[PDB]
């Protein structure tokens, strides 16, 4: 109530560190992560959301972690409806990152500016703000049918979307392919119509593609 004028107030709902804290980012914004100066408030979100994601990535059953998730959470001066500010977009993605979802693109153990920027870039790219889990100011709705087990207090409601597409299980990390890997083509059932399956190609194909000849 008293610090409601401040830009935004992030707070760790899952087992805070030394007791419930209430992080308040100063107004300034960092230089480097995005061509558009990202507000210190929103940057903290990315840095954490980029944890709950990288942590989900390798969190295992046998291990016991401090917090069942590392994602931050906006509690004040935050626009819940729109999806412009990097913060809103990040927040929107953290309500999902608390379910155990993992990024297809492996998030490095020691995030580097090049990497953080490649994530803050992927976040800005026009897309669809996840809608399964609506946002609240004092509660993080977590899927009942999800690995995440709520701490204790009154911060986690067991909300269940009408149709969440994710199932559980993990993924063992595989090293970077040293050369372009060929892919045998196995077909599905639905088939596209030549007309549509043409421009579809011609809308994303590399037409005047420069190519080497080598030796025949």
């Amino acid at each position: 109530a008293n610090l409601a004028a401040g830009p935004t107030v992030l707070e760790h709902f899952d087992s805070p560190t030394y007791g419930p804290h209430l992080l308040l980012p100063q107004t300034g914004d960092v230089l480097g992560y995005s061509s558009s100066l990202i507000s210190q408030a929103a940057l903290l979100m990315v840095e954490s959301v980029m944890d709950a994601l990288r942590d989900n990535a390798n969190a295992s059953a046998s291990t016991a972690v401090t917090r069942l998730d590392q994602s931050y959470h906006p509690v004040t001066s935050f626009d819940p409806s729109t999806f412009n500010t990097l913060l809103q977009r990040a927040t929107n993605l953290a309500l999902l990152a608390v379910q155990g979802v993992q990024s297809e693109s492996a998030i490095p153990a020691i995030p580097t500016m090049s990497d953080v920027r490649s994530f803050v870039a992927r976040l800005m790219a026009e897309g669809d703000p996840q809608q399964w889990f609506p946002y609240r100011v004092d509660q993080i709705l977590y899927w009942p049918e999800s690995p995440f087990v709520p701490p204790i207090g009154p911060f986690y409601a067991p909300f269940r979307p009408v149709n969440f597409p994710f199932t559980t299980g993990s993924y063992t990390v595989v090293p970077d392919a040293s050369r372009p890997l060929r892919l045998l083509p196995q077909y599905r059932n639905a088939t596209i119509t030549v007309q549509q399956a043409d421009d579809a190609y011609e809308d994303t194909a590399l037409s005047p593609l420069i190519t080497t000849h080598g030796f025949c």
Binding site: A1, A4, T76, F78, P80, S81, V137, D138, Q139
Partner: protein, 411 residues
């Protein structure tokens, strides 16, 4: 402060849409001013000073019972999430400051006429983000939900910490002595209806103790003789309108503190409540407390209407519940007198008359509600009187139970 309230809308008593006229929306929520903390600007020092008889709203409680219905139709945000609009009317802005005719080019999706919709101060992510500003809408939805969970008389709450009155709570009351029950709920209501006050704030204790003493008086116990910390309410002698109540710090034996935490939900049970300025200013006041403190616990389910079962966050049934008692003004007052009669307060031959005096009074605030009831049907899309069927009037509800809950509350 406090950022969490759960409400429940009125019940369209076997009727279609919400029982409130357009003529009403521009009679309470109109003028464009914020229809919020206005509930109280329709009450006087008593009843003889209000247009609460033969008229558009024939009742000392016919206002709130209407404004409450009107609130149901315009609270969709807390129901789902969007603002919506009921019959060319929708809040002007996201802060729900007031009502106003639907814009013209960007109209809100027409509301969905549904009865008894639950509410969550969370389903509206903007509410808490502004808390301070639209603070009022909280305490109000609360006043609503305490009349909605009931059908025949609002359901407030009572307390009594095992400790002595919080000093700065005996000082705050001793400056409200002569003041009538009406102007007490006034300060009470007016207070917990602007700027989120911490439940720790002095006033809450004071106004919460003023709702515990009022009850002790309403059941003899806390009388002119056996006062609380020094207070008790003196009711006007029935013969000239006993529907009064004034706080009076005396100095007679102090009703010793209870042996434990005494909590219970009490609601007026007979239609009588609808016209007793004291049975409303009191109940309404006891609700001022709950509004700025969440809700003690879950109100017992047992004795309660059919549309109030397991009402998430509100009603209960298990352990987190508190037995809810309901008294009847007459079966009540009778014992309220017997108490006085036992404490030598009055003669042994004066209580068999005090009842006559008061009982005839209740028979007057009875041929009047029935008249207004069979005057303002209900199929007329309105509910200034709220149906009650000529029966509940005599209905000797819990009563006997609350008369005991009063003693244990002020031993």
């Amino acid at each position: 402060a406090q950022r969490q309230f759960f409400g429940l809308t009125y019940n369209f008593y076997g009727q279609p849409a919400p029982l409130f006229d357009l003529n009403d929306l521009q009679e309470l929520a109109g003028c464009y001013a914020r229809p919020w903390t206005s509930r109280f600007s329709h009450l006087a020092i008593s009843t003889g000073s209000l247009p609460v008889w033969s008229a558009r709203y024939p009742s000392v409680a016919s206002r709130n019972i209407v404004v409450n219905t009107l609130l149901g139709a315009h609270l969709n945000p807390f129901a789902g999430g969007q603002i919506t609009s009921h019959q060319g009317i929708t809040w002007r802005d996201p802060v729900l400051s007031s009502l106003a005719p639907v814009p013209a080019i960007q109209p809100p999706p027409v509301w969905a006429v549904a009865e008894n919709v639950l509410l969550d101060s969370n389903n509206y992510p903007t509410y808490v983000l502004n808390l301070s500003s639209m603070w009022p809408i909280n305490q109000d939805v609360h006043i609503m939900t305490m009349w909605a969970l009931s059908d025949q008389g609002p359901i407030y709450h009572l307390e009594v910490p095992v400790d002595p009155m919080p000093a700065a709570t005996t000082a705050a009351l001793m400056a409200y002595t002569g003041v009538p029950i009406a102007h007490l709920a006034q300060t009470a209501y007016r207070f917990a209806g602007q700027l989120p006050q911490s439940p720790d704030s002095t006033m809450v204790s004071t106004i919460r103790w003023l709702s515990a003493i009022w009850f002790g008086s309403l059941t003899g116990r806390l009388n002119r003789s056996r006062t609380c910390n020094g207070f008790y309410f003196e009711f006007a002698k029935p013969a000239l309108n006993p529907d009064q109540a004034v706080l009076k710090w005396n100095d007679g034996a102090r009703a010793a503190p209870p042996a434990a935490a005494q909590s219970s939900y009490i609601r007026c049970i007979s239609p009588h409540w609808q016209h007793q300025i004291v049975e409303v200013a009191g109940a309404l006041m006891s609700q001022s407390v709950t509004a700025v403190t969440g809700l003690p616990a879950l109100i017992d389910e047992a004795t309660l209407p059919a549309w109030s079962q397991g009402v998430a966050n509100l009603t209960g049934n298990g352990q987190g519940v508190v037995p809810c008692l309901d008294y009847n003004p007459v079966p009540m007052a009778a014992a309220r007198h017997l108490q006085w009669r036992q404490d030598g307060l009055i003669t042994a031959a004066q209580e068999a008359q005090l009842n006559n005096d008061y009982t005839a009074y209740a028979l007057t605030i009875e041929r009047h509600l029935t008249a207004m009831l069979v005057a303002n049907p209900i199929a007329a899309g309105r509910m200034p009187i709220q149906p009650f069927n000529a029966a509940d009037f005599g209905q000797a509800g819990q009563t006997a139970a609350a008369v005991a809950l009063a003693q244990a509350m002020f031993v």
